Amino acid sequence: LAASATKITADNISQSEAWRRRRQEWEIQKNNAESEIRQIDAQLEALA
Amino acid sequence: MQEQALTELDAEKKILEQSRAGAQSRVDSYRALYDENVSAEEKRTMDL
Amino acid sequence: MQEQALTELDAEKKILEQSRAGAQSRVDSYRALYDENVSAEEKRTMDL
Amino acid sequence: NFVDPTLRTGQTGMMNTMLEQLSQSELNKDTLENGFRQYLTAFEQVADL
C-alpha cells in the first residue's frame, strides 16, 4: 500500500512537470507572437 | 496612373493591418494561457 | 526623393532586427530547455 | 557553492517523503502544512524509540 502511494505521488509529480513544460511552450509561443507584432509594426513603418 | 500606384499602397496597409490583428489575437490568447499557469481545477487534482 | 529611398532601408533594418531579436529569444528558450534535460523533480519521479 | 537543500547525503526517509509531497507546483499553506504535520508525525515516531 506504501508502494501504491509512492506510485500515486510519482504520478502527481509527473502531472505537475508536464504542466510546467506546457507553460514553457506557451511562453515560447507568446514570445513568438509578441516578436511578430513588433516585426509587423516595423513593417508598417517601412510601408509608411 | 500614379494615383493607382498610390492607392495600391493603401491596400498594402490593409494587408499588414490584418496581419497585425492576427498577431495581436495570438498574443492575447497566449498571454491568457501563460498567466493562468494551472487552472483552479488542475490545482484540485494535484490536491486529490 | 533619393533620401526617402535611403531611409526606407533604415526601416528595413528595423524589420530585420526585430526578426533577429525574436530568433534570439527562441534560441535562449530552447537552449535552456535542452540544457536542463530532466528537471530536479523529473528525476525524483523516476526514483519513486 | 555546492550545497543543495534538496539533495543531501544521509538524508532520512522522512525528509525524502516530505520532499515528494512538496514537489508539485501549487504550494499553498494547506499543502505545505499537511506535509509538515506528516513529517512531524514520522519525527515523533523515530524520536519515541
Question: What do these coordinates show?
Answer:
This is part of a larger assembly, with 4 copies of chain A. Chain A has one helix at 2-47. The first copy, chain A, is mainly alpha-helical. The radius of gyration of chain A is 21 Å and the shape is rod-shaped. Chain A starts with a helix and ends with a helix. Chains in contact: A-B, A-C, A-D, B-D, C-D. Chain A binds chain C through residues 6-7, 9-11, 13-14, 16-17, 20, 24, 27-28, 31-32, 35-36, 38-39, 42-43, 45-46, and chain C through 8, 11-12, 14-15, 18-19, 21-22, 25-26, 29-30, 33, 39, 41-42, 44-45, 48. The PDB classes it as toxin.
Concise summary:
The structure is cut from a larger assembly and holds four copies of chain A. With 48 residues, chain A is mainly alpha-helical. Chain A has one helix spanning 2-47.
Quaternary assembly: part of a larger assembly
Largest contact between protein chains? A-C, 23 and 20 residues
Q: What Rg of chain A is obtained from the alpha carbons, in whole angstroms?
A: 21 Å
The largest β sheet of chain A comes out as: none
Strand content of chain A: under 5%
Overall number of strands of chain A: 0
Number of helical stretches of at least 4 residues of chain A: 1
Order of helices and strands of chain A: H
SS class of chain A: mainly alpha
Termini Cα gap of chain A: 70 Å
Shape of chain A: rod-shaped
Helix content of chain A: over 70%
